[PDB]
Amino acid sequence: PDQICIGYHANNSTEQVDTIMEKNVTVTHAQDILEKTHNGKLCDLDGVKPLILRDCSVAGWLLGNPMCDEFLNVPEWSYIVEKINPANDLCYPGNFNDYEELKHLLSRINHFEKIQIIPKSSWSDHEASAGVSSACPYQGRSSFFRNVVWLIKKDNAYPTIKRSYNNTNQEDLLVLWGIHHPNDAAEQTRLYQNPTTYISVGTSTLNQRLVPKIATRSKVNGQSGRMEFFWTILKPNDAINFESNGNFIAPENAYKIVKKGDSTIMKSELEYGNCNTKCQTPIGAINSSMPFHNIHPLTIGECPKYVKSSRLVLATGLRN
């Protein structure tokens, strides 16, 4: 009549897990290890506010599109946020040469310090103030990129330009310039006098010679002319030498690279959220002790490990 029995625990839990052998197996206790929730906004990363470009593109920012005056001298940033299709890009139509490569450098950079290298008042024999277009409006008038100068002829003359800037700073220097491709020979001589023109640019590594490309093009922002922009990193102690007899979009301001580090250029339609986080995705921030998450593959910060799984649950107790 006296007896003893061996057994195990049970309860009224309905939580289930999977196994290689079996699926849909109910257990007493189960530990979820996948984070599925984000806060839905863009935040500071470990107390450092990101650069939110809003309606401007990286190009518009760096060149100084008049619509982007907000970003003339930005503070240090943790990451950069650009919309999928920013409205304020190259106000005057054209292209940025090696633009994706520049953006890659920018993802390694945390802070610029903008400095003027060629004052606008420096141009004695050329007109520096007439270089404006209705394609780049500012407060209801024709304007132009802030950081570069569209020089044109003065007194029906465009003498050959020969300018050098020696980077006497300790920082690497991002320098930008451009060339104007006019619509026709008439426009060419109207603006620059000389019919056949060129732009030479030299550094210790750079050896450029550009020639304008006159052609009939479709109007973009009411312009059939085009402007093509170029860039380079002028190392400390090197010099850059410009020479031109027309179509030159000269540098005015350049960017000292002040801080490097882990950064990214995030594509997102979200705005600044007035939050702080350890882990950002383009779709929202994450505060989680979970080892995995499935919010978004592209992230920055101390984050959990991304997976494509919808569900991920560990067994801790026994089966029922």
Binding site: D2, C5, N11, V17, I20, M21, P297, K305
Partner: protein
Amino acid sequence: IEGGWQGMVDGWYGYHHSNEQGSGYAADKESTQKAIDGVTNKVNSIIDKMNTQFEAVGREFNNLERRIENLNKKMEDGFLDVWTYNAELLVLMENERTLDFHDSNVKNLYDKVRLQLRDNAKELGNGCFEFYHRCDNECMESVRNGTY
């Protein structure tokens, strides 16, 4: 066993005794203590094992770089699939090992008691033993304490 008992909520494994004095549940603290440590050790190791997996990076290509853009996309999706497979498969391996680990502890507890009273008891089959000599509350503890 036929099934598990809702009765005991002390530990994961345990005993139930019938006796001239009375009857009641009794959880094995020695077995439950080593079990709680074992599962907590695993859940942490799965976190550490996957921490050197692939981290995807935004890259930008222009409209005459369509071949490389595609290569890049396929590459990042490739690894994300690979590690999602490793993650999913690892969980099914950890889970399977958890449930077999529990069934292992039940049988090991049944064999421990059976070895402790060889000729002095009769194994019924449903996970119980009938004592030949009657066994009061102190003997029950003596079978449980591991000093019978």
